[PDB]
């Protein structure tokens, strides 16, 4: 496959909505390469609308564990967890193309049933939102209150805007 | 496969509604062919009814990055985002057959909910319509005021009307 080819050169590709299925696949890849050579860097290209919070954390956690620096490239759209992963990349190695987009908002969910049940789902989602926000601040350089107000509602941004916010370090031109 | 033989000789195919999947495949193939020989050119054959604006921008952005000059050939139809990319080919290397059809229009989308939410959507939608029109006008040579008015509703153009408008550079006869 065209992807197996790009893999012989250390390049993983995340280009679909994030569900458990995707998460696992991208995790086994980052592991396979780190084993081939704990020195040569790896590169992860991103184009996604976000998805499961738990699913992206799996990915976000393997990028940290492995020795090899992981660099990111925004191609098309990097929204929600997807934009989260982009910022998660190695300092100085976070890229975006000229016409890419970046969208950051707050966690979505649901609840149905007894007062007490609706309460349980509510406490959890608030907690996640909080965890996700504190890391966003450390990656961007933005203070918490900002990453808190700026995510209240859908917040789309252009590549020049992402660079300013600190989600990426450079724009690949030609 | 018939399409496999196509890549082996540097010919990429784009024959379907543009979505995040078709988009990622096309991007990789471009980067692959640039690896084997940054000097020889690559051809992008087109026949698509359009698709996602973000899916389309990635394709466009990658054509601009690689060193090989990328030619484009409209075959059958090239509507919406399809005609855009078509116009994104190397100057002097954009084609189309005698009976090909090309169409341009404005972005499409939707919004539901609170007044505040429909606003966020209206702003993003109108913004993409703006970025698309400005690149179209740099590629065609046409003034922006014209692109804007000419795209208020579906605009179907013959291959001759395509050549004259600046969407292509030469018609292939025999």
């Amino acid at each position: 496959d065209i992807y197996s080819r790009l893999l012989k050169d250390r390049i993983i590709m995340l280009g679909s909505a994030i569900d458990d299925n995707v998460a696992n696949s991208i995790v086994s890849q980052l592991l396979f390469l780190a084993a081939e050579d704990p020195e040569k860097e790896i590169s992860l290209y991103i184009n996604s609308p976000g998805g499961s919070i738990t699913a992206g954390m799996a990915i976000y956690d393997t990028m940290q564990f492995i020795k090899p620096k992981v660099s990111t490239i925004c191609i098309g759209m990097a929204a929600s967890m997807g934009a989260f992963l982009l910022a998660a990349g190695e300092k100085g190695k976070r890229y975006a193309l000229p016409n890419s987009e970046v969208m950051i908002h707050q966690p979505l969910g649901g609840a149905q049933g007894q007062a007490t049940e609706i309460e349980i789902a509510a406490k959890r989602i608030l907690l996640l939102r909080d965890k996700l926000n504190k890391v966003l601040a450390e990656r961007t350089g933005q203070p918490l209150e900002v990453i808190e107000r700026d995510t209240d509602r859908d917040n789309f941004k252009s590549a020049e805007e992402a660079l300013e916010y600190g989600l990426i370090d450079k724009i690949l031109t030609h | 496969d018939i399409y496999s033989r196509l890549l082996k000789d540097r010919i990429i195919m784009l024959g379907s509604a543009i979505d995040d999947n078709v988009a990622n495949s096309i991007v990789s193939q471009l980067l692959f062919l640039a690896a084997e020989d940054p000097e020889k050119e690559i051809s992008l054959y087109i026949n698509s009814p359009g698709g996602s604006i973000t899916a389309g921008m990635a394709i466009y952005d990658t054509m601009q990055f690689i060193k090989p000059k990328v030619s484009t050939i409209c075959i059958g139809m090239a509507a919406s985002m399809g005609a855009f990319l078509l116009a994104a080919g190397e100057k002097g290397k954009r084609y189309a057959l005698p009976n090909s059809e090309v169409m341009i229009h404005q972005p499409l989308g939707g919004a539901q909910g609170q007044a505040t939410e429909i606003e966020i959507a209206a702003k993003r939608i109108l913004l993409l319509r703006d970025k698309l029109n400005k690149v179209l006008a740099e590629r065609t040579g046409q003034p922006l005021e014209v692109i804007e008015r000419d795209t208020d509703r579906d605009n179907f153009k013959s291959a001759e009307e395509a050549l004259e408008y600046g969407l292509i550079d030469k018609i292939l006869t025999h």
Partner: peptide, 6 residues
């Protein structure tokens, strides 16, 4: 996407 990613 090189020079330099790879």
């Amino acid at each position: 996407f090189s020079p330099x990613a790879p």
